Symmetry: C4
Subunit: 93 residues, 4 copies
């Protein structure tokens, strides 16, 4: 429970950093920066948005390496410690 809260906060902070960075350096609207940060760290990578500056490319390399781990950690705990219990409870005959 507290573990999920910590990953939640960590993920939020990571996404906030990405939103601030891409909106500033890559000139994206804040919503697009947040959306791009999520699409990046979850490894979907549509490419509708991508860094055009070298500063952006370098940050993206570091952002991915440092963010993928926590984002997927949060996703795992969300599905196993939150979603799983709910589906099971919806079964209880």
């Amino acid at each position: 429970d507290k573990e999920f809260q910590v990953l939640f906060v960590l993920t939020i902070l990571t996404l906030i950093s990405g939103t601030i960075f891409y909106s500033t350096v890559e000139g994206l609207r804040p919503i697009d920066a947040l959306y791009f940060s999520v699409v990046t760290l979850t490894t979907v990578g549509y490419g509708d948005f991508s860094p055009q500056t070298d500063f952006g490319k370098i940050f993206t390399i570091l952002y991915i390496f440092i963010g993928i781990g926590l984002v997927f950690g949060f996703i795992h705990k969300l599905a196993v410690n939150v979603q799983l219990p709910s589906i099971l409870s919806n079964l209880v005959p």
Copy 2:
């Protein structure tokens, strides 16, 4: 066995939600909406389709976080509890 059936249903429901959402808000043909939902949740992300509206971008963020876990859960069980047994049986000398 029953576990696989539950993940199967859950995945179907998740994909149906995506199909309805993207066909309505993003104006995609139903087949393209389903295809896009799958390409998104499996993290392939070709980008041949991507949300153009803010409503679509926000939903996509939430859809990914909530759907990746179950989709990959189903994929895992499919390969370990269904595909694996079959390949092994095809070996039995």
Copy 3:
């Protein structure tokens, strides 16, 4: 060892199916079809190639769900049962 050989063969067969399908239905050159199949099943998804026909989109949905599991199974075993031993042996003082 034999496990790695089985996953190797399974991966080859899966990629051959994709190569045949995309070169025929989507009209790609065989090399591009193989390349696209790999980029798809490893979830990279550049999007330089993507299915344009409904037949192709439907097959892609099924191909991903059935192929991701085995492809990543092979990748895991390759890194743990082949690459890992080699790096360790290159260390042995």
Copy 4:
């Protein structure tokens, strides 16, 4: 600790190979080649860069299969043996 250092070095070497290959065969600037190599091995795959030559497509297939395992191995150890301890220490009441 030493495990993390080995994966660190291995990842560096893998990325250096990609940087050299794509800058030479695909004609990318070194920074773009490094960026593309990272985007590829972490499976993000934006597609802003992608191999245009057959030599590049073939290398990419092999690069992905051999590199994804080590890159994600490093990411895992980075998050579990480096990031995790730090966040926990930042909690210690």
